């Protein structure tokens, strides 16, 4: 699934509003990327399919703080 594993960003649907305002259904896809993170605590490469915004969340919190929250809500990494 195209779901951001950290911030929980899931794709939502919208409309293509043109100059004549005709509504056509589409979807908003996140900027998801598979990045490999090394942890100092566990000494292991952790691969995570996260958004580009979610990488900046990791930068402030720390990779040990992020993976602690994924253990709480039952996410597998």
């Amino acid at each position: 699934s195209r779901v951001c594993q950290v911030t929980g960003k899931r794709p939502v649907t919208g409309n293509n509003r043109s100059h004549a305002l005709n509504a056509t259904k589409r979807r908003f896809l996140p900027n998801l990327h598979s990045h490999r993170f090394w942890v100092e605590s566990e000494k292991r490469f952790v691969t995570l399919r996260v958004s580009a915004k979610g990488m900046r969340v990791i930068d402030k919190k720390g990779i040990d703080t992020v993976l602690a929250e994924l253990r709480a809500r039952g996410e597998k990494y």
């Binding site: 490999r36 090394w38 100092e40 900046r56 930068d59 402030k60 919190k61 720390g62």
Partner: protein, 54 residues
Amino acid sequence: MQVILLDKVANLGSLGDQVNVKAGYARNFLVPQGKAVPATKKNIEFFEARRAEL
């Protein structure tokens, strides 16, 4: 970003200073390959004690 160095890395390093570098050079080279530490406002006080005491 605000990462602090520890090594003889080329001309942005002086054995540890807060620099203004891009995030791509921060992670996967400085964030662990050695040679540095992230500055998440906990290491700026911990390694400051390493500067003063040593």
